[PDB]
Design a binder for this molecule. Structure first.
Ligand SMILES: Nc1ncnc2c1ncn2[C@@H]1O[C@H](COP(=O)(O)OP(=O)(O)OP(O)(O)=S)[C@@H](O)[C@H]1O
Lengths: 197, 144, 72, 72
């Protein structure tokens, strides 16, 4: 045939400050998407690229809200909202599925952009975020886990209230992938960051 | 722009130059919604609309002189222009399908390196063109 | 039927230390609109999210002016 | 203006002039794409329409007085 159709596995998945490997739901079979974040000091303005719905802008805003709620626990800048513009890149346009595409993944992305620490890899994370530190459950973790198994990524955290999903899926996917349960975005501040702060 | 025409003569493609200095609106760089008579795309899209091929050599002007008094930058938009794998994902407001400017060869102009927008300082090469002496000016005068 | 799709008779709902549940009406029928207000430090300006109309902000300042007479 | 008229008299080609100051868009410098009755070109095409030759002495009036905001 020639060239591999995709980038080869875990050579695209590299530990970077900028990159972010998050699970995606696509109606022709879900994928995983490479989110890239760049935070060097600015003024606080958020910018978007890639035919995006505005809901991802507000989810990034909610991620900024959580980083404003619990700043000093991980070496985050004390007042960055007046001095750090945030600019994210998304490879695709909009999810037809409602809610954030991967809200806590973007929260970890801009938190790693603010702390300037590379993201851990071999862990593909996704979820939808609220304003009181509560990661509300996501429907359709089926195709997300299918994509992560296709990504070769076996460690996939989930929101806490998707724990009942772990009994209604058949076993053959559940055994091939490791699953952790989280409730706080501060919990996944320790699960995708290469150092503990 | 003589350097740009030199490069475009080397590649025998089409050459064009567009202004970017003094642009305040992202919607100047992007298009606009279809909410008025004669709705319009961006500067870049109409610049491609006057070129007839999808691989010309295109020059910018004064990319160190954008401004934006609201949230967001056109820095992220020409950062979308930067990566050819990101070129097929443009923000667009009159049009909607992201155009294929992957083959459009990119050359840029900024008089001051320091006032180029800081989200674009990645993947710039500082090749400083200094001033000119007496005899160098005389020689290029007398020659060309 | 599988897992119970919806939360049961509510004796313990989600942990709600900054928020509360809320009753409303849609065309298709009402939902429990648990308003999420997040009190972050800032410049005391009013920062809306949620694709909101203005009726929200005068109701907002009605509450704000209520507790600005009722701080302590 | 009469300077330009004199220069065209010396030129022995016909002077023209168009008060282009105060124009807010490209839609009457280039015209617009035809879609109804009352479709019209730019002012320059009007100008050289009322000049019956292809090589006139055209005098621009107020380039510095152009306005910009909408419609190209
Ligand atoms: N060292 C030189 N620097 C600049 N121009 C030179 C030089 N040597 C020769 N030239 C000639 O000068 C012309 C191009 O320079 P200019 O016209 O002064 O600047 P420009 O290219 O028109 O505009 P810029 O530099 O892009 S803002 C061409 O005719 C070149 O052949």
């Amino acid at each position: 045939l020639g060239i591999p159709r995709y980038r080869p596995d875990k050579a695209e998945t590299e530990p970077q400050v900028g990159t972010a490997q998050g699970l995606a739901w696509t109606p022709v079979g879900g994928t995983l998407l490479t989110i890239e974040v760049a935070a060097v000091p600015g003024s606080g303005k958020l910018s978007l690229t890639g035919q995006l719905g505005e809901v991802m802008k507000e989810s990034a805003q909610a991620a900024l809200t959580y980083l404003r709620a619990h700043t000093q626990d991980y070496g985050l800048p004390e007042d960055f909202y007046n001095k750090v513009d945030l600019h994210v890149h998304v490879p695709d346009g909009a999810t037809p599925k409602d809610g954030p595409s991967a809200g806590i993944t973007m929260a970890t992305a801009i938190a790693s952009a603010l702390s300037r620490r590379p993201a851990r890899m071999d862990i593909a994370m996704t979820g939808e975020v609220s304003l009181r530190g509560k990661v509300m459950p996501i429907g359709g973790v089926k195709e997300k886990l299918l994509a992560a198994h296709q990504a070769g990524i076996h460690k996939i955290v989930l929101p806490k209230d998707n724990e009942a999903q772990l009994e209604e899926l058949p076993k053959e996917v559940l055994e091939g992938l490791e699953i952790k349960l989280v409730e706080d975005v501060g919990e996944v501040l320790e699960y995708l960051l290469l150092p503990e702060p | 722009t003589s350097l740009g025409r030199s490069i475009a003569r080397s590649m025998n493609r089409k050459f064009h130059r567009i202004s970017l200095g003094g642009v305040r609106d992202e919607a100047e760089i992007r298009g606009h919604r279809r909410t008025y008579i004669g709705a319009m795309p961006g500067k870049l899209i109409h610049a491609m609309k006057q070129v007839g091929v999808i691989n010309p050599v295109i020059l910018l002007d004064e990319i160190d002189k954008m401004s934006s008094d609201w949230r967001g930058d056109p820095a992220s938009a020409m950062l979308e222009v930067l990566d050819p794998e990101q070129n097929n994902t443009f923000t667009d407001h009159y049009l909607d399908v992201p155009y294929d400017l992957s083959k459009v060869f990119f050359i840029t102009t900024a008089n001051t390196l320091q006032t180029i927008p800081r989200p674009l300082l990645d993947r710039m090469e500082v090749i400083e063109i200094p001033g000119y002496t007496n005899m160098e000016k005389q020689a290029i005068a007398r020659q060309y």
